Design a protein around this ligand. Sequence first.
Ligand SMILES: O=c1nc[nH]c2c1ncn2[C@@H]1O[C@H]2COP(=O)(O)O[C@@H]3[C@H](O)[C@H](n4cnc5c(=O)nc[nH]c54)O[C@@H]3COP(=O)(O)O[C@@H]2[C@@H]1O
Ligand SMILES: O=c1nc[nH]c2c1ncn2[C@@H]1O[C@H]2COP(=O)(O)O[C@@H]3[C@H](O)[C@H](n4cnc5c(=O)nc[nH]c54)O[C@@H]3COP(=O)(O)O[C@@H]2[C@@H]1O
Ligand SMILES: [Ca+2]
Ligand SMILES: [Ca+2]
Ligand SMILES: [Ca+2]
Ligand SMILES: [Ca+2]
Lengths: 237, 237
Amino acid sequence: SLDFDFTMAFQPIVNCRTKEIFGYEALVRGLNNESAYSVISRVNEDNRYLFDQMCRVKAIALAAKLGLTSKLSINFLPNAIYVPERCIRTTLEAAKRYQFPIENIMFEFTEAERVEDVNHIKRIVEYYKSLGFQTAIDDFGSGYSGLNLLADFQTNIVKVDMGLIRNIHADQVRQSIMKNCLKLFSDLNIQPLAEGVESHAEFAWLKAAGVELMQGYYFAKPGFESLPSVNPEFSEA
Amino acid sequence: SLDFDFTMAFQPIVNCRTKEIFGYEALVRGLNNESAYSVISRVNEDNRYLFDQMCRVKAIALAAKLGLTSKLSINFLPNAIYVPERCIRTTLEAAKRYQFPIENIMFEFTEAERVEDVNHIKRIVEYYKSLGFQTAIDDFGSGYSGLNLLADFQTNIVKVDMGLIRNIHADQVRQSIMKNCLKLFSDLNIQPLAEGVESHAEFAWLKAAGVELMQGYYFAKPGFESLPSVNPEFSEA
Ligand SMILES: O=c1nc[nH]c2c1ncn2[C@@H]1O[C@H]2COP(=O)(O)O[C@@H]3[C@H](O)[C@H](n4cnc5c(=O)nc[nH]c54)O[C@@H]3COP(=O)(O)O[C@@H]2[C@@H]1O
Ligand SMILES: O=c1nc[nH]c2c1ncn2[C@@H]1O[C@H]2COP(=O)(O)O[C@@H]3[C@H](O)[C@H](n4cnc5c(=O)nc[nH]c54)O[C@@H]3COP(=O)(O)O[C@@H]2[C@@H]1O
Ligand SMILES: [Ca+2]
Ligand SMILES: [Ca+2]
Ligand SMILES: [Ca+2]
Ligand SMILES: [Ca+2]
């Protein structure tokens, strides 16, 4: 091992149908709640492996210590894809010691560099799948993560990038994109998740369109080393 | 200025509904028909502007020389910096001197790098549209160019990346992507173009799916300094 230290924040994912917590996304934070990028910008090429392992262990240990009983979603470091199909060992043992079933752990994948890897990320997604992990395509529709990923493999979940959601209630173009992507997701039996929801107007539009899993400041900011509670305003029913 | 020289190849775009030629895409070649990548890899940052200009004029002058009477589609260099809206003068002047109507010239845009200065490509696209040029999103559904582009601006055409077309007659995931993307394109009144069509089987499925404009080796490989004719096999089927 370790060169610098950091901890985790947690942001709830809500099932807007049932009003229950689907899970929490783990997000790296500095020890004084500094930004994730501030932490990751300290990550270089010799850091990729060890930082990735600390990330998984810190999130799992803190989720366990906090008593999380729903799912834990961890960001997969995108350039940690050096084909080491046994470096998942550190993860499985971390889950064992913390009595956290692998099936309650979801890994979020993003393409970060255009170099039509697919098979490279696909080998990982299907391998993680074979171990019992849940998987998600993250930032779908943010330029990098796109249809090319969905053509060669399908995850349990697709997190729609928040740029596509912003002000969707007033944006007929964004409205058409989402409707046809939801029909696509349903055709591929993939569960959608609307990310970055900021206002009642977005949430209300996303919910009528059929999105159940949602995430964003409207429900709760991330909580430093905590499991935030959810705004009761949406859950009025 | 320039340091090296090059010329153009041309590949027909067919409208399978009208069975007519839509136009040709210009594709860079070495002076002895070397590959586009071999030529383009010679471009650095002090080359970008002048090479981008040389490309446009050579395509317009040679299409004129060859007697091209349909549309001319020119690849917009993805790293064509923050060029002001007055470097378009060279383009307009070449079109005029060669009596090539501006409305018969289409520019193809790809995202490449930096995912969030999509407001910049929007300014360029809307500026070119205002002058009368046709515009297209190239490589749609591959690594870089995706839904984020369609969310903030709409071009005349979207060229669906050939990775999504390959084997589409037998690939239910790809069939699902295209089906839902065609309905999206139609909602945005965007004309789709299926790129890289290689077999009768692919062409037949895309055509039954409603695609009119297509491009690929099935119809004709690019012609060095020439305008290829198109395989009569599609004009029957
Ligand atoms: O309503 C909202 N309106 C606006 N913004 C909202 C709303 N709701 C949430 N957000 C925000 O969405 C981001 C998290 O989602 P994302 O994964 O797409 O972004 C990246 C990526 O994950 C990476 N990263 C982070 N941690 C790790 C890690 O442990 N291992 C590997 N990579 C890691 O750096 C993240 C950006 O840093 P963050 O600031 O920490 O988080 C933001 C913030 O919470
Ligand atoms: O059925 C098929 N099966 C298989 N392959 C098929 C089929 N049909 C077509 N092809 C191929 O598809 C590509 C053309 O389209 P694309 O734009 O996506 O490709 C890039 C890019 O645009 C850029 N480039 C090229 N010229 C310029 C330029 O003037 N200014 C700026 N950038 C320029 O380098 C191009 C690659 O060079 P190429 O090898 O010549 O072209 C290929 C080839 O012909
Ligand atoms: Ca994420
Ligand atoms: Ca995300
Ligand atoms: Ca092109
Ligand atoms: Ca292309």
